[PDB]
């Protein structure tokens with residue numbers, strides 16, 4: 419079974435590895451220009467031609483892919499929609515690996531959004547690729563738990579592990595044409611967009627648990643959840659929830675050692691953070707750096 423693969427980052431690398439282990443012949447990999455593994459370096463080491471056009475949806479790339487005669491196409495965290503002109507070239511179709519429990523969390527950054535939203539489970543889905551992103555029939559799915567202390571990077575690794583398992587289990591079935599698919603239930607679908615560093619703003623009126631989830635969702639090496647002291651941005655890199663009710667106004671500094679901020683329900687301890695583009699520091703030092711005192715209002 420011959421394939422053309424669209425791949426990026428760690429999911430891209432493990433998808434390529436899984437295909438090679440399952441005995442697929444990879445004729446070409448399409449990727450993007452740049453902590454993640456490099457699909458291009460993997461392709462190069464494996465002797466596979468690799469290409470990173472900004473937009474693969476060009477007549478000449480369509481023609482080129484056609485000339486490679488793929489049986490099947492895979493996408494493993496390729497970022498750009500691939501037009502029907504390309505997808506229809508492969509007689510056995512096209513499959514994508516998405517990092518959520520479709521039909522929930524279609525779209526961008528499902529790793530981060532499930533954390534933002536306080537989910538206790540997520541998963542990986544392999545589905546047929548169709549014109550609408552993340553919307554085609556499901557062929558395999560694997561559910562995993564999100565632990566209360568998971569952060570983006572730790573959940574990322576768990577999703578990668580799950581993807582490897584799912585692919586190892588499923589790729590042989592595709593190769594042999596055993597491949598039941600079930601349509602997604604559109605009434606159950608949810609979809610999320612690209613996140614910017616700004617979508618990680620901490621709003622202190624929210625429950626401490628919700629703010630904690632935001633901190634986890636974009637913890638290092640993601641860009642971090644943030645607030646301000648006047649013109650001074652600061653990032654909360656790690657936190658802990660103090661569930662006890664405070665009579666303090668949301669955003670009030672309850673204490674500076676440890677740095678504890680009243681929320682809409684409970685309080686949030688800022689365990690580590692940074693002021694602006696300065697270095698990471700413990701919360702008590704951050705408090706001093708920012709000029710906060712007990713009773714300061716954020």
Ligand SMILES: Nc1nc(=O)c2c([nH]1)NC[C@@H](CNc1ccc(C(=O)N[C@@H](CCC(=O)O)C(=O)O)cc1)N2C=O
Nearest residue numbers: 493496497498499500514525547548549550551552612
């Ligand atoms: N045909 C096809 N189907 C897919 O499911 C699929 C591909 N291609 N290619 C790789 C990838 C692309 N996934 C996505 C996911 C979301 C958007 C999206 O919502 N785009 C918005 C907003 C701008 C943006 O985020 O790019 C839009 O209005 O198009 C696009 C592509 N993908 C499966 O992962």
Ligand SMILES: O=c1ccn([C@@H]2O[C@H](COP(=O)(O)O)[C@@H](O)[C@H]2O)c(=O)[nH]1
Nearest residue numbers: 527530531613614615616635636640641
């Ligand atoms: O919750 C998120 C998820 C991603 N990004 C940004 O989205 C881009 C895509 O990230 P990759 O998807 O991590 O490249 C990067 O600039 C990344 O920092 C955020 O700001 N917040």
